[PDB]
Nucleic acid binder design. Structure first.
Ligand SMILES: [Mg+2]
Lengths: 121, 119, 149, 50, 153, 203
RNA sequence: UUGACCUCAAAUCAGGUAGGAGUACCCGCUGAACUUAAGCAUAUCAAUAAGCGGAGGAAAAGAAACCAACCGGGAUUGCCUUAGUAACGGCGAGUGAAGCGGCAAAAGCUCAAAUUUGAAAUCUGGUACCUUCGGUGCCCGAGUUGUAAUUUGGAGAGGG
RNA sequence: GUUCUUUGUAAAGUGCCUUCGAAGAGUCGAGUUGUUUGGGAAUGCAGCUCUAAGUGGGUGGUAAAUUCCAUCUAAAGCUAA
RNA sequence: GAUGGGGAAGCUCCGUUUCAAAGGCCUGAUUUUAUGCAGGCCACCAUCGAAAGGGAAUCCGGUUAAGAUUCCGGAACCUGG
């Protein structure tokens, strides 16, 4: 019989059908709940005098935030927990090892009105 | 005080989830009061109640998965037994009691007799 | 070094001999545990006499061939002359040695006679039923002593 | 340094939290043998070596 | 790739070297016409498959249930014999009538003694192409030998 | 029975048929890797005499090792000691090439158990062995009471502890007056006859 | 053209397994020198320390290619003894077992090499059901380049 | 000890006659080299070279030739105290 | 400095594109549709290595006890969609 024509001197590995996994049993069998939800990303507010100066002057809430949370999670959870639209989030890591978040709210909401609704003033 | 596990066990999973989120709301409301008050020992009861609710939810889900995988080989590894790595790798009782048919014929023909010696 | 009129000593203590010193402090406790092991073995084999029957046999060298002693097991020729198979003898408690031979008729006759007395003295239970309990003795060697001819 | 890594800042935070005297109610407990913070560290006297 | 290169250069080397006559006692295989008609003869005597064996045993069990024949309701089989130790014992017992040896056994030392043994014991042998052909004759993958020991009239 | 024909043919290694076959196969084995899987035993009679059975869970690898002495691995031949220990070149390894071959095969397949090994070929540079291995997790070896003893954990790395046939040969484990140094273990006997035994009532 | 076989691959293919720790005791490899010889090189320290590989509750060894030379013994291990002996050794310093005897504990065994050839009788896996350390049915596959039964030299096999 | 299944037209053992009786190879062994041992014209181990037999082979502690005798059965494997 | 390989009794050593069957890229085609099958293109061949080398893009004014090209007010720019 005739052989297959090859226009290249290189021989490559042929393409093989690669199946997907169909396991007989589940890996962990109970999916974990939300590791980092809204109640875990927001621990407590900071109520020092420097922070309390910001809540009428800058319209900025100050929260202590878990170290695993980023600005998207902070913004989403502030919107979910307090039903407030936020303008921006600026975070830092304090020298004691915790994380502090300055959340500046939109102009429609008043952080002074929201702080004593939460329960601190 | 707190919640009791035996009375938590009679509820469904949605009621347990709702009780969990009200417990978390209460924990946040106590944490915002801890900074103003000197001492607040009521936080520990809410924390242990949250732990109790999570334990009951996890045990309900795990028992449901056990009954889903009931009566078949290849159940998940965290559901099957733990004991030790060596005891899991050891031969089962059937494989250890496997004997050749030649030895079985010899054992049936000549077993160890029971005998006594005085008369 | 060498000194007054004394014998020449050979004390082999030039290695780290203090690393290998075995002092048998556990002689008494080892004896107690050994008796415990004998008693629990006897309770485990509760009718059987704790040791097999050994043949009488002639000691090897010219220093010791004047004496007779106990062997490992009976010859297949001896158990065939006694009138029972080797497998059955091993199950009823007779030590069988497949690798010793009979070249001495007196030793052969003594071992055949010893097997005859053992078969007269034992009681073999049925494999299934009543088990007529029979108050074990603990030493077939003591019930069949080795006698110098 | 000003440009530091997070591992170094984490260890610095832990040592800052450890830098405190003894809580004064510890001495009032029964069978208390603790008199003072024996593991106290100052930046002038000994270095962290991290 | 190297497996292609090894499997080509190996059969290159096996004819570059002067082979000693016990090898190249092979490679004069049977011609294709006589090979076709001897496989046509051997195809009539094929060992029983698993399903027809199973219904044969059900018929035998029913027959010993009804009439208690000593497993002799079924007639005498007529099948090709296969398996190397089996056919060597048949050749040594002079029971084989015709022996076919595959030409491509990959330890060749499994079958180099077979033509000399067949010549000494007087059994007619043929070196034939295809251990796969012998295997599909005896319902295996590879058979490496075949033998007719007793044929119908 | 073809196996005794295969044996007594295999003893004629300088017959022309075997040296031609050896000459082809040694090239074929140089062209492959140092350790590679053999599909079937080259000598099935030798494999089944050493204990192989053609069932699922019996594995054959092929292996080549470098021949010759063991050069003492010291920089520039300096030994830093007494002149009795200044030898570098003519020193010999105490284990066999078969032993180090099956030990490398066991390290390659640590999930298997080494049963035996046999010589297949050699040249000036390499010696060629085939190693029989048995899978102690396969159910055909978990069952089949003739072979489930290999699943006991005391048989992990028998070739590394010297418990195979060539391992016991190299350790000297044999009955007799020629093996008084090495009969129950050389270091065990050395400790036994270098121990000082003192009783409670001193003898 | 189509369908096999052999060999070699690829898959986040189905299910498994190895690594590391500990390391007193155990099985091996590798391997010194200080020291002693009133110096020192063979020797000794020492077939040791350090280094490397590999196990278990013990490990290893173990049912003779044994010991013997007798009226013979009879797997292995350990203790008492043989014995600071036979022997080795700049025959210097030094080193140095084993047989028998008494005792503790005692236990024996199985593959390869045989034609089932009037029926591969054998086995993994998947699936369904069940009483689930597994069983039954069915289906692929492994396997004749040999899986079961039969025998292990003390024997044993085929006939009568 | 008490009870249920009958395993199983299965398996095993024993006596006499007859024909047999398969038993492991780059191994055993030999030379040489190194190491080791109480082992001494070479105790074991290992490298290289040579390389068997089948009334054969090994051992029998002084090398070698010749004639005997004794005792085991290697080069595959499991196993409590 | 892994892998493929080759040494080493071994801890590990060599080598970094090598005696390797070493991969991904866009258009789409199909609209049981998922992403295989229509196609076609390409052969580097891990990765780590600069807070002074290369490099997308922000300035001014004000503000604190202690922060700012980062906050506030104003005015811009870049990247991805
Ligand atoms: Mg070398």
């Amino acid at each position: 019989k005739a052989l297959k024509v090859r226009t290249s001197a290189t021989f490559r590995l042929p393409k093989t059908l690669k199946l997907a996994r169909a396991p007989k049993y589940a890996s962990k069998a109970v999916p974990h709940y939300n590791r980092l939800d809204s109640y875990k990303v927001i621990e407590q507010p900071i109520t020092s005098e420097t922070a309390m100066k910001k809540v009428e002057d800058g319209n900025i809430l100050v929260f202590q935030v878990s170290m695993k949370a980023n600005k998207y999670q902070i913004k989403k959870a502030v919107k979910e927990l307090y039903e407030v639209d936020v303008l921006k989030v600026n975070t830092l890591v304090r020298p004691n090892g915790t994380k502090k978040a300055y959340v500046r709210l939109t102009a429609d909401y008043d952080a002074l009105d929201i702080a004593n609704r939460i329960g601190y003033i | 005080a707190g919640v009791k596990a035996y009375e938590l066990r009679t509820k469904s999973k949605e009621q347990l989830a709702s009780q969990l989120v009200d417990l978390k709301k209460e924990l946040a409301e106590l944490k915002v009061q801890k900074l103003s008050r000197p001492s607040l020992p009521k936080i520990k009861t809410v924390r242990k109640s949250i732990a109790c609710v999570l334990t009951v939810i996890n045990e309900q889900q795990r028992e449901a998965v056990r009954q889903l995988y009931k009566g078949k080989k290849y159940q998940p590894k965290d559901l099957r037994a733990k004991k030790t790595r060596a005891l899991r790798r050891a031969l089962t009782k059937f494989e250890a009691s496997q004997v050749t048919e030649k030895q079985r014929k010899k054992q049936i023909a000549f077993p160890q007799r029971k005998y006594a010696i005085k008369a | 070094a060498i000194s007054k009129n004394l014998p020449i000593l050979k004390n082999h203590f030039r290695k780290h001999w203090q690393e290998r010193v075995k002092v048998h402090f556990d002689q008494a406790g080892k004896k107690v545990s050994r008796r415990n092991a004998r008693a629990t073995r006897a309770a485990k084999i509760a009718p059987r006499p704790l040791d097999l029957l050994r043949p009488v046999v002639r000691a090897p060298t010219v220093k010791y061939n004047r004496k007779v002693r106990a062997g490992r097991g009976f010859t297949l020729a001896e158990v065939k002359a006694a009138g029972l198979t080797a497998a059955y003898a091993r199950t009823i408690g007779i030590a069988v040695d497949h690798r010793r031979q009979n070249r001495n008729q007196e030793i052969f006759d003594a071992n055949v006679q010893r097997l005859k007395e053992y078969q007269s003295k034992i009681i073999v239970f049925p494999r299934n039923g009543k088990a007529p309990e029979a108050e074990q003795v603990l030493s077939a060697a003591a019930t069949f002593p080795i006698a110098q001819p | 340094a000003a440009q530091k890594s997070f591992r170094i800042k984490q260890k610095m935070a832990k040592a800052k939290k450890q830098n405190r005297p003894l809580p004064q109610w510890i001495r009032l407990r029964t069978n208390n043998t603790i008199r003072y913070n024996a593991k106290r560290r100052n930046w002038r006297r000994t270095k962290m070596n991290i | 790739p190297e497996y292609v290169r090894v499997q080509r250069q190996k059969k290159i080397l096996s004819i570059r070297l002067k082979v000693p006559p016990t090898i190249a006692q092979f490679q004069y295989t049977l011609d294709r016409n006589t090979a076709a008609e001897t496989f046509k003869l051997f195809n009539k005597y094929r060992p029983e498959t698993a399903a027809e064996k199973k219904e044969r045993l059900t018929k035998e069990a029913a027959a010993v249930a009804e009439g208690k024949s000593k497993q002799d309701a079924s007639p005498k089989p007529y099948a090709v014999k296969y398996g190397l130790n089996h056919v060597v014992a048949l050749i040594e017992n002079k029971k084989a009538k015709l022996v076919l040896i595959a030409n491509d056994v990959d330890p060749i030392e499994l079958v180099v003694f077979l033509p000399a043994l067949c010549k000494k014991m007087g059994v007619p042998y043929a070196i034939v192409k295809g251990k796969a052909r012998l295997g599909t004759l005896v319902n295996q993958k590879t058979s490496a030998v075949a033998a007719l020991t007793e044929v119908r009239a | 029975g073809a196996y005794k024909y295969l044996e007594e043919l295999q003893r004629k290694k300088q017959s022309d048929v075997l040296r031609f076959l050896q000459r082809v196969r040694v090239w074929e084995y140089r062209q492959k890797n140092v350790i590679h899987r053999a599909a079937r035993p080259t000598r099935p009679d030798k494999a089944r005499r050493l204990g192989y059975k053609a069932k699922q869970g019996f594995v054959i690898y092929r292996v080549r090792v470098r021949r010759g002495n063991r050069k003492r691995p010291v920089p520039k031949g300096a030994t830093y000691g007494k002149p009795t220990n200044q030898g570098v070149n003519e020193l010999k390894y105490q284990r066999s090439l078969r032993a180090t071959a099956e030990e490398r095969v066991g390290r390659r397949a640590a999930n298997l158990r080494v049963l035996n090994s046999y010589w297949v070929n050699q040249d000036s540079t390499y010696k060629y062995f085939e190693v029989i291995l048995v899978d102690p997790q396969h159910k055909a070896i978990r069952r089949d009471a003739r072979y489930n003893w290999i699943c006991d954990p005391v048989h992990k790395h028998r070739e590394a502890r010297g418990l195979t046939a060539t391992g016991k040969k190299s350790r000297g484990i044999n009955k007799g007056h020629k093996f008084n140094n090495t009969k129950a273990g050389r270091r065990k006997t050395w400790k036994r006859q270098n121990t000082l035994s003192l009783w409670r009532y001193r003898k």
